[PDB]
mmCIF file of C-alpha atoms in Angstrom:
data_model
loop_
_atom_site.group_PDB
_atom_site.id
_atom_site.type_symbol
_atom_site.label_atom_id
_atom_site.label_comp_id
_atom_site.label_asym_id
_atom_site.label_seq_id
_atom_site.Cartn_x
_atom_site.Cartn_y
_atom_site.Cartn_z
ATOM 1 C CA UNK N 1 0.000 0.000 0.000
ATOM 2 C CA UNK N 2 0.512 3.275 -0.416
ATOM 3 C CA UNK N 3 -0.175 6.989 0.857
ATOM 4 C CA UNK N 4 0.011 10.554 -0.219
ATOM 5 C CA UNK N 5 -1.338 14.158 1.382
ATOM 6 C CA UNK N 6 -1.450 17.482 1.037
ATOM 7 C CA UNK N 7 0.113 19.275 3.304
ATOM 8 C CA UNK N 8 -0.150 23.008 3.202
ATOM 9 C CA UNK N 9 1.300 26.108 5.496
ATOM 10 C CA UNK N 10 -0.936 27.477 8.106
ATOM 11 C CA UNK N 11 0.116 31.355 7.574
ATOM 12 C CA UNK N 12 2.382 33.410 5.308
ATOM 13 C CA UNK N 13 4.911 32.848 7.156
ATOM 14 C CA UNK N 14 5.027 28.670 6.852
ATOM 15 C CA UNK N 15 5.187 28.933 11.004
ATOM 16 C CA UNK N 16 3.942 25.443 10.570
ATOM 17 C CA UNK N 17 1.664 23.203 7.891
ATOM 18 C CA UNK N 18 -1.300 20.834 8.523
ATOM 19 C CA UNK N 19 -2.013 17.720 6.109
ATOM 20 C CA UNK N 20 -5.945 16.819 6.807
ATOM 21 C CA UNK N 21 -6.294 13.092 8.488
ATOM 22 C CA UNK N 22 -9.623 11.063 8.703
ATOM 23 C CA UNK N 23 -10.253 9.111 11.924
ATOM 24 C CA UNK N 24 -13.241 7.274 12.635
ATOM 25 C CA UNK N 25 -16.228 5.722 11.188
ATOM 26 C CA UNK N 26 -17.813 7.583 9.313
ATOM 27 C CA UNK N 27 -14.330 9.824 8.511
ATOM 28 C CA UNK N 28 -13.975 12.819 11.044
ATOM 29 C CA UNK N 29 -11.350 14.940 8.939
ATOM 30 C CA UNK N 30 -8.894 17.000 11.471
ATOM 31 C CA UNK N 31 -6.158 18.909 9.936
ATOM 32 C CA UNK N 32 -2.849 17.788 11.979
ATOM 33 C CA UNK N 33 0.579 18.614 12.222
ATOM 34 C CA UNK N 34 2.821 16.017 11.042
ATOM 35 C CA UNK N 35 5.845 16.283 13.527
ATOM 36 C CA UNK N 36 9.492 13.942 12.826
ATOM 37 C CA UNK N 37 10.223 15.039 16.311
ATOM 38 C CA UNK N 38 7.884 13.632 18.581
ATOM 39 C CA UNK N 39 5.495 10.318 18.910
ATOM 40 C CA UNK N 40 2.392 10.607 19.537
ATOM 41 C CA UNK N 41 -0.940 11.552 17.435
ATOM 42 C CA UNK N 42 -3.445 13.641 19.924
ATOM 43 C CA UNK N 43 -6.069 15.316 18.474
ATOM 44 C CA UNK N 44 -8.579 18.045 19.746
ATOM 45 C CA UNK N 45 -11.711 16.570 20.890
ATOM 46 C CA UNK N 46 -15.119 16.494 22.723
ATOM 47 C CA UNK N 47 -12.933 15.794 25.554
ATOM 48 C CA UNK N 48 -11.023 18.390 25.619
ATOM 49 C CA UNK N 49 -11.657 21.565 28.324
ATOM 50 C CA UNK N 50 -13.959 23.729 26.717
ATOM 51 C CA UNK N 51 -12.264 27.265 26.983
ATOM 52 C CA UNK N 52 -9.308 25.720 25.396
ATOM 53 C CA UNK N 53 -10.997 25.308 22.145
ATOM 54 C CA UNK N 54 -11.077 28.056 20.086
ATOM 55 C CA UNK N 55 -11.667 26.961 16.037
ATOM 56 C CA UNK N 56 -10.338 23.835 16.031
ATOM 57 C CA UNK N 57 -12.249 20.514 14.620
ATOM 58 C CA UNK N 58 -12.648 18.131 17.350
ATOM 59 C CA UNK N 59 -12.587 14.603 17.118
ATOM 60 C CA UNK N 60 -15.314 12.801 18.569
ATOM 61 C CA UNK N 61 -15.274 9.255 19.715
ATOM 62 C CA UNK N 62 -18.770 8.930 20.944
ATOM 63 C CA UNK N 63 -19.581 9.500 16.896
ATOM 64 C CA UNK N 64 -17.269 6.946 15.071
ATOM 65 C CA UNK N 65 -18.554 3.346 15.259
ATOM 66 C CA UNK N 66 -14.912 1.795 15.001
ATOM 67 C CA UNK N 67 -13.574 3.981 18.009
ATOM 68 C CA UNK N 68 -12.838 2.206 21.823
ATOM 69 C CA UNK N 69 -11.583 3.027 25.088
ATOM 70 C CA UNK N 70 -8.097 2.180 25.453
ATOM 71 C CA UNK N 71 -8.831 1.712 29.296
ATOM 72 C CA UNK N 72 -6.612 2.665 31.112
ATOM 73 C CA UNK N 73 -4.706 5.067 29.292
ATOM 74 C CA UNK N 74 -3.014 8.478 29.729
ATOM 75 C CA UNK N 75 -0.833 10.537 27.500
ATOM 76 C CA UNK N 76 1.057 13.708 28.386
ATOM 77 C CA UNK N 77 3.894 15.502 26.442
ATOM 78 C CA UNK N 78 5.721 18.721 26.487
ATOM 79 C CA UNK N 79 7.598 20.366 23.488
ATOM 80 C CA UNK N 80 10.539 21.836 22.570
ATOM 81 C CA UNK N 81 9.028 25.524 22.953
ATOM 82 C CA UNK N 82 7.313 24.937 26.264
ATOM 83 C CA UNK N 83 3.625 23.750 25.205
ATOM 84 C CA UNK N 84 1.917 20.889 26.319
ATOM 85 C CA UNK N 85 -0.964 18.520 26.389
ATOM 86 C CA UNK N 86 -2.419 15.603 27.664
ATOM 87 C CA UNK N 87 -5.513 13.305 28.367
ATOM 88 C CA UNK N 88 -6.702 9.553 27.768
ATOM 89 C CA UNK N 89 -6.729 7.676 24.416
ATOM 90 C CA UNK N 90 -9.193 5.762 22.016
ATOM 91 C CA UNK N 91 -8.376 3.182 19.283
ATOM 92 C CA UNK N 92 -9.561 3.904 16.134
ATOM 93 C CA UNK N 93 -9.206 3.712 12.091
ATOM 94 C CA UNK N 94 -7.002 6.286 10.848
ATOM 95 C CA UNK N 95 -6.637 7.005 7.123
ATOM 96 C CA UNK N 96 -3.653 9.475 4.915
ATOM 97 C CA UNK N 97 -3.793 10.428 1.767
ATOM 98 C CA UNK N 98 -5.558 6.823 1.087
ATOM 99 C CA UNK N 99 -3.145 4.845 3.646
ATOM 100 C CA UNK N 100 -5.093 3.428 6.229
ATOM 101 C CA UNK N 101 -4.138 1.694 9.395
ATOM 102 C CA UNK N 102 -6.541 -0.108 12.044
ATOM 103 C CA UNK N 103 -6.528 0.276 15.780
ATOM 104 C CA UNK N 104 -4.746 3.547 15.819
ATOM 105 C CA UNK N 105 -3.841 5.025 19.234
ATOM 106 C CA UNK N 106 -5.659 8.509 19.025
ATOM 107 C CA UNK N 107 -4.550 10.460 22.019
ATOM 108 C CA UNK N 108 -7.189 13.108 22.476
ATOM 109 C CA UNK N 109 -6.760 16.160 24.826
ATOM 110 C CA UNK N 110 -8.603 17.022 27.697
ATOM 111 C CA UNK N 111 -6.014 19.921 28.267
ATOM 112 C CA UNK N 112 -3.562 22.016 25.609
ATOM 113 C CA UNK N 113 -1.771 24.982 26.609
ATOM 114 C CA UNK N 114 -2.694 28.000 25.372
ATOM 115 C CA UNK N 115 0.012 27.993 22.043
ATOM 116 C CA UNK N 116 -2.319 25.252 21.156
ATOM 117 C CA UNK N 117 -5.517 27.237 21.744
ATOM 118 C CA UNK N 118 -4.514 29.873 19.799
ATOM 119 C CA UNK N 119 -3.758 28.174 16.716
ATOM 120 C CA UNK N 120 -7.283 27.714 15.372
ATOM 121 C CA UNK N 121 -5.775 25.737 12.602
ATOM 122 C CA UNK N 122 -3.696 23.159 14.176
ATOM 123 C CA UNK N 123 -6.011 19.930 15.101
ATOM 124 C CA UNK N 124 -3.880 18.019 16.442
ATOM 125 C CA UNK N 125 -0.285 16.942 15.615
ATOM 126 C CA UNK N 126 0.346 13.363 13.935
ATOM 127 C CA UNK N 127 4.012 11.975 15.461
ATOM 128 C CA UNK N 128 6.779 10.320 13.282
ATOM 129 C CA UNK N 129 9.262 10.352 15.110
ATOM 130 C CA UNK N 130 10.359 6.843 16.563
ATOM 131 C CA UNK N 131 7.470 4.955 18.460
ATOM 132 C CA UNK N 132 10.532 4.732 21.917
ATOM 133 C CA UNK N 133 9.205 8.433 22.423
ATOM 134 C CA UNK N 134 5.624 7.925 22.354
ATOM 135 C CA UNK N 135 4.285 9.277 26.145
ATOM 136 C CA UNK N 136 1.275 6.973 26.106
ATOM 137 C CA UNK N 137 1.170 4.935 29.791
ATOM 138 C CA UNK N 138 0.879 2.381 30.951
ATOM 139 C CA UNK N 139 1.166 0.907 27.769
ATOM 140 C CA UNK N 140 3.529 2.790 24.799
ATOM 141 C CA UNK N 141 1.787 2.931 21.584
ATOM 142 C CA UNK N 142 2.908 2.927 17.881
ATOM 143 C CA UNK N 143 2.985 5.493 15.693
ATOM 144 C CA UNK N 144 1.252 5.392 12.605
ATOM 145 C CA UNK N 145 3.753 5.234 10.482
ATOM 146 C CA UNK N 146 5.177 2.430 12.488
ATOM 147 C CA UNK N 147 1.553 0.995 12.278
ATOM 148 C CA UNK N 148 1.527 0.989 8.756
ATOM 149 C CA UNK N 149 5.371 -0.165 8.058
ATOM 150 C CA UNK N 150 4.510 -3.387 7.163
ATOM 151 C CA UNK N 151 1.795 -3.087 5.018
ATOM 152 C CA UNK N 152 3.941 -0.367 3.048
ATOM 153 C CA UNK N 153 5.169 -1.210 -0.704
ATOM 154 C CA UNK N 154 8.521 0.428 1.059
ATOM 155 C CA UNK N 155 9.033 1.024 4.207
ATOM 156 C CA UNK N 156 9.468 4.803 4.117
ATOM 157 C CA UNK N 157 8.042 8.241 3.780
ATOM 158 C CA UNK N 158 8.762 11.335 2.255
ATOM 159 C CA UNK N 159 8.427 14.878 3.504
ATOM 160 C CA UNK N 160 8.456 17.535 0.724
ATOM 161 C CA UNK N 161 7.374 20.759 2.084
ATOM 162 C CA UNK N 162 6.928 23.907 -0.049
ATOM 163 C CA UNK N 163 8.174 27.574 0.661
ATOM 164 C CA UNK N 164 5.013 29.829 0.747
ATOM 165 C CA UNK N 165 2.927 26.911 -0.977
ATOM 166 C CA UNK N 166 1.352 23.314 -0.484
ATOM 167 C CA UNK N 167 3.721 20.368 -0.720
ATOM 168 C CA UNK N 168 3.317 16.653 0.055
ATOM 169 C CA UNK N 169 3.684 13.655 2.484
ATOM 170 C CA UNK N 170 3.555 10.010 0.512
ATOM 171 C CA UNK N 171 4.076 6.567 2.626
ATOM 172 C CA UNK N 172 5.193 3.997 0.900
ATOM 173 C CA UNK N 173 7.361 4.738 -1.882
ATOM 174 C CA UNK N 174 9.787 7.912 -3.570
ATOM 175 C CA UNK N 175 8.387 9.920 -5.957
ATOM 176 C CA UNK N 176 11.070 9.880 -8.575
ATOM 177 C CA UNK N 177 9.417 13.137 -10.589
ATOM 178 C CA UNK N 178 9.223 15.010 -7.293
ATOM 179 C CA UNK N 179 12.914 15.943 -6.920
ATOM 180 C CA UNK N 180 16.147 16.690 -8.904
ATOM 181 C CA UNK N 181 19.158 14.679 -9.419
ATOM 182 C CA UNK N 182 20.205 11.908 -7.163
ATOM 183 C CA UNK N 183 19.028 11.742 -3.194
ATOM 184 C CA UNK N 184 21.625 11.242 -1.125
ATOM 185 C CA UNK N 185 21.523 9.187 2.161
ATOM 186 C CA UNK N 186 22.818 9.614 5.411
ATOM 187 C CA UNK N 187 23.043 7.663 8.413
ATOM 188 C CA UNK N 188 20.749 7.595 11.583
ATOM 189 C CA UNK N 189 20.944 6.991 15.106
ATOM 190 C CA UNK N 190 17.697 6.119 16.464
ATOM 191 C CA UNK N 191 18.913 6.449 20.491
ATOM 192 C CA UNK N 192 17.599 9.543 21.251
ATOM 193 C CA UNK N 193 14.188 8.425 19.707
ATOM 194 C CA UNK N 194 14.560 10.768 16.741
ATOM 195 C CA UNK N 195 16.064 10.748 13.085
ATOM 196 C CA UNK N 196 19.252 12.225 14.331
ATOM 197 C CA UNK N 197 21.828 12.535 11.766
ATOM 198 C CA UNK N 198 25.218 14.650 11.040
ATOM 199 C CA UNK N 199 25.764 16.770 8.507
ATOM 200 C CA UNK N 200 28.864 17.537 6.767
ATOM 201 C CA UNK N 201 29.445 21.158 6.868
ATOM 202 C CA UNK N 202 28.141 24.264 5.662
ATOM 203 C CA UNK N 203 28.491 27.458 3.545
ATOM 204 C CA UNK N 204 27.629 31.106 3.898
ATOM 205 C CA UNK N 205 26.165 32.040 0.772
ATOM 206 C CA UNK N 206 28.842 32.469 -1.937
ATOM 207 C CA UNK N 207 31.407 31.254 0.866
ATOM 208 C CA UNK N 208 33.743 28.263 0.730
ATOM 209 C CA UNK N 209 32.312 25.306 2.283
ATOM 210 C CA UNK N 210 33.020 24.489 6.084
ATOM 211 C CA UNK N 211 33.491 20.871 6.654
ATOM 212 C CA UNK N 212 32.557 20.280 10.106
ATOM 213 C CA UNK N 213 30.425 17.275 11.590
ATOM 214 C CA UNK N 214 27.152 18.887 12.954
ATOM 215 C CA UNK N 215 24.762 16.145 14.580
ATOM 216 C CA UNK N 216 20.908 17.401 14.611
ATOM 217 C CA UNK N 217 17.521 16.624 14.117
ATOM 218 C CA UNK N 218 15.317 16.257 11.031
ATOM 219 C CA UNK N 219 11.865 17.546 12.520
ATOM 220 C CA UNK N 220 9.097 18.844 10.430
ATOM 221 C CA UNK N 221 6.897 20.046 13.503
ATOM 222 C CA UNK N 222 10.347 22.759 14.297
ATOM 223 C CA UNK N 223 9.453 26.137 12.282
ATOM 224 C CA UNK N 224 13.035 27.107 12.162
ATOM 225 C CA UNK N 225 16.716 25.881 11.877
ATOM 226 C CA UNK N 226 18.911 25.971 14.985
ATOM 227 C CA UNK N 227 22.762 25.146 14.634
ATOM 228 C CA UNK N 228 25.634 25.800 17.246
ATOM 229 C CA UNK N 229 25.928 29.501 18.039
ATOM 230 C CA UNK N 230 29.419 29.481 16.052
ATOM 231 C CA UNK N 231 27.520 28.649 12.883
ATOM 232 C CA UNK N 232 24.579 31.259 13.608
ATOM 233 C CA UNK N 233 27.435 34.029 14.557
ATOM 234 C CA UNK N 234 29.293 33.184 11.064
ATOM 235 C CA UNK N 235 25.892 33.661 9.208
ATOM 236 C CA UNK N 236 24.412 36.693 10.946
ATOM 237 C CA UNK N 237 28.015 38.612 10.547
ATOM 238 C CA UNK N 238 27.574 38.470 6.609
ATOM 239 C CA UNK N 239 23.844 40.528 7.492
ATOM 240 C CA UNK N 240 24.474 44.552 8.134
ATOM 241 C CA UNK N 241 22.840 45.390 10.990
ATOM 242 C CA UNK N 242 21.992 41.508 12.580
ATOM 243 C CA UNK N 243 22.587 41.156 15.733
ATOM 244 C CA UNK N 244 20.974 39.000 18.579
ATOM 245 C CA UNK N 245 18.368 40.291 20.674
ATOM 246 C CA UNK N 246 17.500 39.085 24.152
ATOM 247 C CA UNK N 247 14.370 41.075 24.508
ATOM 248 C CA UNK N 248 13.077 39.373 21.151
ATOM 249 C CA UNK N 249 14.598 36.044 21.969
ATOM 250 C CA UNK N 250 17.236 35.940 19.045
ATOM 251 C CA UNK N 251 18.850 37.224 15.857
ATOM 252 C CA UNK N 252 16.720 39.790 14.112
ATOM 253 C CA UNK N 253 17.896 42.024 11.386
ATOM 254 C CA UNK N 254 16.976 44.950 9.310
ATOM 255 C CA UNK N 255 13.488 44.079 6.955
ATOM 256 C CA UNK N 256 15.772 46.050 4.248
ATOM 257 C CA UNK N 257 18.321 43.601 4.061
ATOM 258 C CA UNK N 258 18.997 40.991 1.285
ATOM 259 C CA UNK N 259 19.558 37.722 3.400
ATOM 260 C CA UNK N 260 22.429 35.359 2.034
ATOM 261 C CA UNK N 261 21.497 31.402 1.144
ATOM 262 C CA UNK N 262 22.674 28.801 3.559
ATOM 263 C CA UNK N 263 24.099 25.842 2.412
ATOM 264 C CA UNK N 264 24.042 22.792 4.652
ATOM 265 C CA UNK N 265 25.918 19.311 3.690
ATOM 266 C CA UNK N 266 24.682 15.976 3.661
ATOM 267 C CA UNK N 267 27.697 13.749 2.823
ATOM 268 C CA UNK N 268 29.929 14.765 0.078
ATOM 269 C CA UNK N 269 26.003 16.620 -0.916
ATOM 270 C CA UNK N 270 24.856 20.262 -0.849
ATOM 271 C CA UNK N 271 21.543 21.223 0.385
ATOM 272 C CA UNK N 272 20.885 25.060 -0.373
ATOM 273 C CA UNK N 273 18.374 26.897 1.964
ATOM 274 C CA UNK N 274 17.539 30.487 -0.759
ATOM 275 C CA UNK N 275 17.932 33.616 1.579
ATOM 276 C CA UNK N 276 14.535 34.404 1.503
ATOM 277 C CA UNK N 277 13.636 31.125 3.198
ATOM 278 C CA UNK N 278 15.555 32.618 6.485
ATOM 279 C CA UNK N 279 13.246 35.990 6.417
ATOM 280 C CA UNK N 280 10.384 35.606 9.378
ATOM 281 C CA UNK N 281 9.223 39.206 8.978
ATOM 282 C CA UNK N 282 8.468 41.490 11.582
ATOM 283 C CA UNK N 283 9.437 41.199 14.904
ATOM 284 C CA UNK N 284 5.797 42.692 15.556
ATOM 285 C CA UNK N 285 3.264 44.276 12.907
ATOM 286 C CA UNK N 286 4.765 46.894 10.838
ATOM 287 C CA UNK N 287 8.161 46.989 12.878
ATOM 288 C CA UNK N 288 11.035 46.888 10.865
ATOM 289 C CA UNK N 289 13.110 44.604 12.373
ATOM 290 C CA UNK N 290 12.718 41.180 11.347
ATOM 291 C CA UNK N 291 13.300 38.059 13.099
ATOM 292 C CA UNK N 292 15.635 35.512 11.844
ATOM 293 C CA UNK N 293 14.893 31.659 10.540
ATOM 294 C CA UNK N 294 18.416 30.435 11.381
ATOM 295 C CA UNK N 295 18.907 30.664 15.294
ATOM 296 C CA UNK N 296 20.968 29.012 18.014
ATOM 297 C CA UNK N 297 20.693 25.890 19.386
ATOM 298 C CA UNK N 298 22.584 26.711 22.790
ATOM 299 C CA UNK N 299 20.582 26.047 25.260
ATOM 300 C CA UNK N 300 18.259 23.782 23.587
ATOM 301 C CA UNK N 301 20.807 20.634 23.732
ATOM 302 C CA UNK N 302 20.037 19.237 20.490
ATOM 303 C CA UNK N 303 20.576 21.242 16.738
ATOM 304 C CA UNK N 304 17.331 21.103 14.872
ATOM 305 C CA UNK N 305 17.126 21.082 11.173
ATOM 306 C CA UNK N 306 13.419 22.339 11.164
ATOM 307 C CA UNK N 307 11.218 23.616 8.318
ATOM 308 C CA UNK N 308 13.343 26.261 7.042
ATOM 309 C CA UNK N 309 16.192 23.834 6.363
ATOM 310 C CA UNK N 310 14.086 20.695 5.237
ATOM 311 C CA UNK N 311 11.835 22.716 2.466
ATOM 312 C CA UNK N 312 14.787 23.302 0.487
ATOM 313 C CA UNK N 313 14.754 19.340 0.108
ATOM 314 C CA UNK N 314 13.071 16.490 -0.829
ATOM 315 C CA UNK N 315 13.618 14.536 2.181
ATOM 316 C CA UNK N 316 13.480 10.514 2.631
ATOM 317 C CA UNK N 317 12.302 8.802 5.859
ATOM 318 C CA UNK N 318 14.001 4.961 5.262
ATOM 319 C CA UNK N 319 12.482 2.974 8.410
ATOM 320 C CA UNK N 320 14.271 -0.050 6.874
ATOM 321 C CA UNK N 321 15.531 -2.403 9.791
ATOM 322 C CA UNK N 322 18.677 0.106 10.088
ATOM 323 C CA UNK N 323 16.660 3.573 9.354
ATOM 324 C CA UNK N 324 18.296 6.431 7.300
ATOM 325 C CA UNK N 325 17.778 9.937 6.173
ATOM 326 C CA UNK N 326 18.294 10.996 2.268
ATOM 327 C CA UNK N 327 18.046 14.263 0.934
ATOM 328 C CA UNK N 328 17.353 15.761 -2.412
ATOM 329 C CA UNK N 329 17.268 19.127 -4.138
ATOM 330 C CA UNK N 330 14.222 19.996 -5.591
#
């Protein structure tokens, strides 16, 4: 079998994108946030506190015929930027872009924090990370891609997100049309329960090319990219008038600049991020400082190569027995 979505930014500024997901019997379409960095797919839902809901589509068990009680139960997970949910968790029949997989774990909320709230277009996120990280006690539950694995014509998945337009998810196979010349892979270590790789080096714009191991994260549900502060520094100098700003919480620079590209490598491969793909715009309506899409991981503990970095590839999932990541220009 075989799957492909949709998925499409939430704003103009790609702060995130949502790829719509049936669940239930008959289909309850929820528009989710597909995340490579965490585990678990949690949904708004009739459950969840009522002041907490403001726009999203709710999931409702009580409605789909195919849905059960996982007695029992609880989830509860925190993110990288400080939100949060939790509550208890139904089985149910989840479909993608035609994929469908049987006895699901869907997580829904009785509480989100407010981030969550406030994103009337978010319904839920949809984890892909590696099924170790899924928060779901007493008993851990699979993700749906790791659900679906073995039903798959491949065992893989493919994120291909677009810059200020709709791009696409597909389980199951490589779209060979949807990417240019060859896809270079990578290796993975799975022990952190993410698709942790190392990159090769990196480039300034039109500057020679650093080689210099730099172990991160693929994650699709991370808006921006966040590298060592060394690497941030080295960009941000080539921008008159960047500089990092505490009160803002990071680098912003001047909405008049031209940004330089930002070349990351993958093996003896170049992945180039376009300098327009690093503008966030303003700090704060009609200010003209702007933030910054490249910003430092210190402090965080892990590098993230988020949105910004993976939309200027075609990027390959493997969950083969030993996984791997493979990139592609586009």
């Amino acid at each position: 079998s075989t799957g492909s979505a949709t998925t499409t930014p939430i704003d103009s500024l790609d702060d995130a994108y949502i790829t719509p997901v049936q669940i239930g019997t008959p289909a309850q379409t929820l528009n989710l946030d597909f995340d490579t960095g965490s585990s678990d797919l949690w949904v708004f839902s009739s459950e969840t506190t009522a002041s907490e809901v403001d726009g999203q589509t709710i999931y409702t068990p009580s409605k789909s015929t195919t849905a059960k009680l996982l007695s029992g139960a609880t989830w509860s997970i925190s993110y990288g930027d400080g939100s949060s949910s939790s509550g208890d968790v139904y089985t149910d029949t989840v479909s993608v872009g035609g994929l469908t997989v049987t006895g699901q774990a869907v997580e829904s909320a009785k509480k989100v924090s407010s981030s969550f709230t406030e994103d009337s277009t978010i319904d839920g996120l949809l984890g892909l990370a590696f099924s170790t990280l899924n928060t779901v006690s007493p008993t851990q539950q699979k993700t749906f891609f790791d659900n679906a694995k073995a039903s798959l014509d491949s065992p893989v998945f493919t994120a291909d997100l677009g810059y200020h337009a709709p791009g696409t998810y597909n389980f199951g196979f490589i779209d060979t049309t949807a990417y240019t010349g060859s896809i270079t892979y990578t290796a993975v270590s799975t022990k952190q329960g993410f698709w942790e790789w190392t990159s090769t080096g990196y480039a300034v714009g039109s500057g020679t090319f650093k080689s210099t191991s730099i172990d991160g994260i693929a994650d699709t549900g991370t808006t921006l990219l966040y590298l060592p502060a060394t690497v941030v520094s080295a960009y941000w100098a080539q921008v008159s008038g960047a500089k990092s700003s505490s009160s803002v919480g990071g680098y912003v620079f001047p909405c008049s600049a031209t940004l330089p590209s930002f070349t990351f490598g993958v093996g003896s491969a170049r992945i180039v991020i376009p300098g327009d793909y690093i503008d966030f715009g303003p700090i704060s309506t009609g200010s003209s400082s702007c933030f910054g899409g490249i910003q430092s991981s210190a402090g965080i503990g892990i590098n993230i190569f988020g949105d910004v970095a993976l939309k200027a590839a075609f990027v390959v999932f493997n969950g083969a027995t030993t996984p791997t990541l493979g990139f592609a220009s586009k």
